[PDB]
Subunit: 157 residues, 6 copies
């Protein structure tokens, strides 16, 4: 049973770690797939994002961090994933998640979307807000693995 | 890997069948658990709902239909389940499912909630709607397993 | 071109009047159809609701008030309607109206659902809210047709 | 500056306590007003709910617990309140609270509605959910004031 | 009775065809109005979009495809439209639709917003997602008229 | 009791005036804080926005208009504000408001988010839409203080 948990992870947060951890507890192998080139210039480069994610999940044995540049469904297919992990925060745009899951189902029906729920602690935080706050002199240490926190300070310095 | 898919299933619909089927694709064993739910004054007795669900899922070897009047979390623990399946049709489902999921996580943290999305075909039906239509002799054959439609026909005048 | 605007109208409010009025602007004939709705244990009997609606819409020559206990879709077909009018106040309405609209489309595909939006003035009222306020002697004259307010006054102590 | 925080509080929960506490931080006096709400067939009598709320808020010197069967707007005016406190957990709350707030503004324009947000810890609980869990002997000690949990234990078998 | 169904239609999809078809069944004349210059550079030029839309609706007699560059309300007014067609997918941002309808009502009250619902098949697809997927090597043939599919391949080649 | 009502106010609208007016009625001092440099180039400059806002609130004695460039929470802290005013329109993105309030609570817990509701008249209008319409030859006089209307015409001329 191979699951894929895709995203930009720019950068990976405690919320993402929460979700991938839950995924590793119900599925044999989990591929944390990092989108290479997003429509908008990411704060960290793919190599940086992969390194940070690898370090943050080093303790999770059945987790494999990989980068990809094609349509997520095309990558999932070549990787033989049959489960698609989506994290649903309390502040998630549910309508958008439905659009996405149905489009992904159209593209690869053999890939089943599965939604996991983070702990209440990370249920109201989005990576976008974390970055905006950090870029504007706010403390976001609480939302990030220590390794990511250190990399973020260097990036904004 | 044992998953539990609880609900009132009054009566079980093609939407429920869609969800439990997707559940069997990713988990070894799935327990379709029917709660007595006296507070909801169900149209069918627990025994009737269990019988209906059993016949509607007889073709699914990985599914086990059972009824329960206990706290769902205790029943799940006692059934050795570690995955809690829920279906999401839209926003309403999502909000209510989050409250329920967080309460269950508080009661049994090792029971991980997982939300699945039905096909577009069943994204707008519910037991309540089917019953209302049936109370007015409307044709609901399209939304229910053969045995369930028959039972509903009989149940009403 | 005959349209049907079904509901429980228990009792009819200025919000309902707003919607039916907009309906008459674009369709030749509009049937305001009041469902018996015993499952909702209406405050007013069907006969009372029809009488109230008739007087509240007497000034609208293109409106015809009628009561029905049949499946709404069959009543619409039997009334030769091809347009199904619904009012949308907000999200909640939208989600529920989609389930209802798709069920009706399954029952009668040639009955096309159309959603209209009320004025800002009536975007937050409902029969339920008006009744709750009235049960406590609150002034609801502003939200109801004169004849309806009188009837509500009488109905309560 | 007197604020009123009305509700059915059947029974009062840590979520309610969170909101009323935040209310006391910005307003001089806060009246926790418990409505009889017979239409909701409360589990506890008004007298029981008031007693429970009184003990659960005894440590809050700025809070005054009272019961009422009048129109909330008239009670607020008669209590000399000019601020109406409401708690928002999510979307559902927001939509319903807007209808209620606009009706109250129509009944008493000088009573200004104010919405507060609970901690993440209590963002997913409700009296209804706690009662359902308790009806099945589930552990709800974490979500209720000590005195309330005891009373709930007793109330049920 | 003249209705206007405005949008960017970049490019026109099966969902748009679904909606305009329903509009032609309840209104005498329907103007499929294509916005000339959108805030963001569209994939197809206005001439291309008009040609594609014309071909896709060639079978609908009471449909007129026209381009416009001014505020939609200004164009609707000069065109003497009294009905404004809006398609409401299950994944629509309802709040935004309300903002839009009320702004359009402020600008031209004689233009009544009417919301139609697409079939379940096209209820979860947005043009934006269709384009993104196509641009990223995904199959979107299913969502587009054959003429649009062919034009899209040439555009991305 | 010092409250802060932050935003871009580009430009200040009748809706903003509605909210700040309500805030001045329940709090001793209200700081209308105008964000200096927004992620996107604003229509009016900070000086212009401050001047317009000052003129529009000149009649409100306990209102102080000030500009700020740092993270809102950092400014609120240095200004010793303990109340954060947020206006909640009927078309507000509630999920986003929850994200924001929780992030602001993380950054400065001593600052309590308080949500106020505008009148029905301004409940469906966003500054973004007002600007878009104005820039595209639509009449938005109704939504703006006369001083802002005059400044807007000059800006677009
Ligand atoms: C009975 C329970 C599970 C609530 O059940 P519910 O009413 O949601 O069951 P229902 O038959 O309506 O639905 C079951 C599931 O199928 C989903 N579903 C229904 N129709 C569809 C459809 N057409 N497509 C996809 N999913 C669907 C629902 O969203 C839900 O996730 C709950 O009250 C419970 O756990 N009761 C036992 C007592 C207890 O322990 N209570 C405390 C719980 S915290
Ligand atoms: C009675 C029906 C139509 C449900 O009615 P409903 O409770 O929504 O009626 P109600 O009076 O509350 O509202 C009627 C319409 O007016 C709208 N409305 C109410 N207030 C407002 C307002 N203030 N502004 C705008 N619209 C409003 C509602 O959203 C609805 O669209 C439905 O149950 C039905 O069709 N019953 C007959 C049996 C049947 O065939 N059932 C199966 C249906 S699939
Ligand atoms: C009783 C009233 C206030 C409705 O009360 P309600 O059921 O919402 O009370 P309830 O105890 O459920 O909640 C009270 C408040 O606390 C909030 N709340 C509940 N749990 C939480 C939580 N965990 N976190 C944050 N807020 C919460 C609610 O959203 C609400 O704002 C209303 O019906 C009323 O005013 N009744 C009197 C008669 C009247 O005048 N009616 C007309 C009113 S317009």
């Amino acid at each position: 049973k191979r699951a894929i948990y895709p995203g930009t992870f720019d950068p990976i947060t405690n919320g993402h770690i929460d979700i991938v951890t839950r995924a590793t507890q119900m599925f044999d192998h989990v591929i944390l797939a990092i989108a290479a080139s997003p429509s908008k210039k990411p704060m960290f480069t793919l190599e940086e994002r992969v390194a940070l994610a690898q370090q943050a999940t080093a303790h999770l044995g059945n987790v494999e961090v990989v980068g990809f540049s094609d349509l997520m469904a095309n990558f999932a297919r070549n990787q033989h994933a049959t489960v698609l992990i989506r994290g649903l925060r309390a502040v998630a745009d549910f309508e958008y998640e439905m659009q996405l899951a149905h489009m992904n189902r159209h593209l690869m029906p053999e890939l089943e979307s599965v939604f996991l729920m983070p702990s209440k602690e990370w249920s109201f935080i989005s990576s976008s807000l974390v970055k905006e706050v950090a870029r504007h002199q706010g403390d976001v240490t609480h939302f990030l693995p220590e390794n990511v926190h250190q990399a973020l300070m260097a990036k904004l310095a």
